[PDB]
Amino acid sequence: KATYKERAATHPSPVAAKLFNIMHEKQTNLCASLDVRTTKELLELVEALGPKICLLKTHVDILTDFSMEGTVKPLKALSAKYNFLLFENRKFADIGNTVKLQYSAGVYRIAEWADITNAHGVVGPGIVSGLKQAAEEVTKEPRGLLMLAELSCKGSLATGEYTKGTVDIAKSDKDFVIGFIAQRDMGGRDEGYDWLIMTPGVGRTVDDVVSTGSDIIIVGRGLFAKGRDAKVEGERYRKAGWEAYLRRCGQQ
Amino acid sequence: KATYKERAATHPSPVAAKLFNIMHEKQTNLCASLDVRTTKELLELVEALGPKICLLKTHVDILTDFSMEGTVKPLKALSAKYNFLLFENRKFADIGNTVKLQYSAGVYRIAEWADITNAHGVVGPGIVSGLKQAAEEVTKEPRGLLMLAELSCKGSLATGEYTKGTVDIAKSDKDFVIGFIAQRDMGGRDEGYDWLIMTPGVGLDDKGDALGQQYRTVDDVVSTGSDIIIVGRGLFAKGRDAKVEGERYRKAGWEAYLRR
């Protein structure tokens, strides 16, 4: 693949280009996935990890005290201060006005602040066109979507065929669908697609996933649980992921 | 398949047994799927459709004025008065505490009032065990789950292999997973399973109605294996009389069932 810097200069999606630039500038391909109960704990961890991440994956549905004023406002401020994007967990899986409103409205109003979101492909391309239309009506700010091509939960049904079908759906909109949550490269280069591959469950080792084609490593509890120091772990994983990236052979 | 009455007598799920009995007693296998924007319109439609349905499928996420006091309270009252169950649309698709709270909390607190809910099987059996645990913690009332085995939306990935995988996940809990949202019979009888097959997208081939003719007919789906017909806008859109349409579809669905 091309370097993050190169991909930022050519990508059709403004959000993807913005993310690739952050990665190049901050020398990080680390995404911190934080699943905590309170806004206080969330903001604490984000403050500590901000300098070392390119992306923050939030889990607003498990927060007990989510609010636009108390959660989103300070989170957006941290995003701006430390320069990283916001990716909300909510795994959309519907179409039409139902999915548009689950994304744009409700108490969470995800589309108003989440730079990136993800969707299950099982419901068909309607989830892509629906979320795209909702994003456009909500804000002029760049928005992008990741398809959940390969899941890692036990007994998941994201088989080869399902993944192939998901990749095909992604090809319907290279402007809005910026990549996948997956465990391996999804190809596409020969066809003019440049997909971001974000891989969770990293601790498989960083070297393993980055070598197989992962562009971003999504690390969760390994960064803050069990009395760990998030600032220290943020640097550990950032260094590991960046060095693995530098060792990978780029397109010459 | 055996009759609805017979199936109710031997079903392991209290919710499915309750539903099958409602179907037999009211002579209906009709589920009204309402996707209106206001609670006022919803309550009006439910009142009109109550006597003719066995199940009401709500779409709370599109309501512009949802409230536990103004929406759920009256809905439960109608459910008790007219004897039908509540099925909320929310297509759950995650696991662990995330899916548990999406089902139990938030402003909607779905588990507190929805007799039946549905889940995508793609995430694995964890969605079944998680929703089940949440249901037990939230209320003493019995709860049931439907797996989204076959989707009708354009370009969906509910292929034969995906459907088989979803059916296998349902087999993991016969007490909680009562059936599927599907377009055909899912079998299981030889294995000791009695799944409710609920099928959306049904029409009556009305004269001059190209829109409704895009859908399979009631006779087609029921004679093929569907147990419940999920009818949408054909019940109330275009200035239609919901009570009249409710009876039309109930009649068609029941007659097709008896023919079966």
Ligand SMILES: O=c1cnn([C@@H]2O[C@H](COP(=O)(O)O)[C@@H](O)[C@H]2O)c(=O)[nH]1
């Ligand atoms: O301590 C943990 C537990 N889970 N995960 C991983 O996170 C993903 C699930 O995250 P999600 O709830 O955001 O989908 C899976 O890949 C799982 O291995 C972690 O990173 N850390």
Ligand SMILES: O=c1cnn([C@@H]2O[C@H](COP(=O)(O)O)[C@@H](O)[C@H]2O)c(=O)[nH]1
């Ligand atoms: O007027 C309509 C529009 N859609 N549907 C059908 O309803 C389902 C969508 O329902 P859901 O939003 O509750 O999933 C699909 O099968 C679709 O063909 C109807 O029954 N009538």
